[PDB]
Amino acid sequence: ERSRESILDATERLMATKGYAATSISDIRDACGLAPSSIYWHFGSKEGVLAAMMERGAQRFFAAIPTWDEAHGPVEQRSERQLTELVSLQSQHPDFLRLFYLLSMERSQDPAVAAVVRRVRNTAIARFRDSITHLLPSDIPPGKADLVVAELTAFAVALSDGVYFAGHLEPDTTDVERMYRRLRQALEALIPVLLE
Binding partner of 63, given its own copies, Na ion, none, CB within 5-8 angstroms per partner class: none
Closest distance between Na ion and the C-beta of residue 10, in Å? 12
Closest distance between its own copies and the C-beta of residue 41, in Å? 28
Closest distance between Na ion and the C-beta of residue 106, in Å? 29
CB 144 within 8 A of CB 80: no
How far apart CA 196 and CA 191 sit, in angstroms, is: 9
* Candidate residues 63, 92, 105, 172; the one interacting with its own copies per rule CB under 8 A: 105
* Candidate residues 108, 138, 169, 192; the one interacting with Na ion per rule CB under 5 A: 138
DSSP 145-187: HHHHHHHHHHHHHHHHHHHHHHHHH-TTT--HHHHHHHHHHHH
How far apart CA 187 and CA 88 sit, in angstroms, is: 21
Per-residue x/- marks for its own copies, 168-187, CB under 8 A?
xxx--xx---xx--x--xx-
Q: Which residues ranging from 44 to 103 are in contact with its own copies (CB under 8 A)? A: 98, 101-102
Q: According to the binding rule CB under 8 A, does residue 157 interact with its own copies?
A: yes
Question: What are the phi and psi torsion angles at 93 (to 5°)?
Answer: -125, 55
Binding partner of 135, given its own copies, Na ion, none, CB within 5-8 angstroms per partner class: none
Q: According to the binding rule CB under 5 A, does residue 133 interact with Na ion?
A: no
Burial 153-192 (b: 16+ CB within 10 A, else e): bebbbebbbebbebbeeeeeeeebeebbeebbeebeebbe
Q: Which is nearer to its own copies, 76 or 188 (CB)?
A: 188
- Residue 113: count of CB within 10 angstroms of its CB: 19
- Cα-atom radius of gyration of the chain, to the nearest Å? 19
* Candidate residues 63, 69, 142, 189; the one interacting with its own copies per rule CB under 8 A: 189
Q: According to the binding rule CB under 8 A, does residue 144 interact with its own copies?
A: no
Q: Which is nearer to its own copies, 34 or 166 (CB)?
A: 166
Per-residue x/- marks for Na ion, 83-102, CB under 5 A?
--------------------
Question: 46 — alpha (psi -120 to 50), left (phi > 0) or beta?
Answer: alpha
Binding partner of 189, given its own copies, Na ion, none, CB within 5-8 angstroms per partner class: its own copies
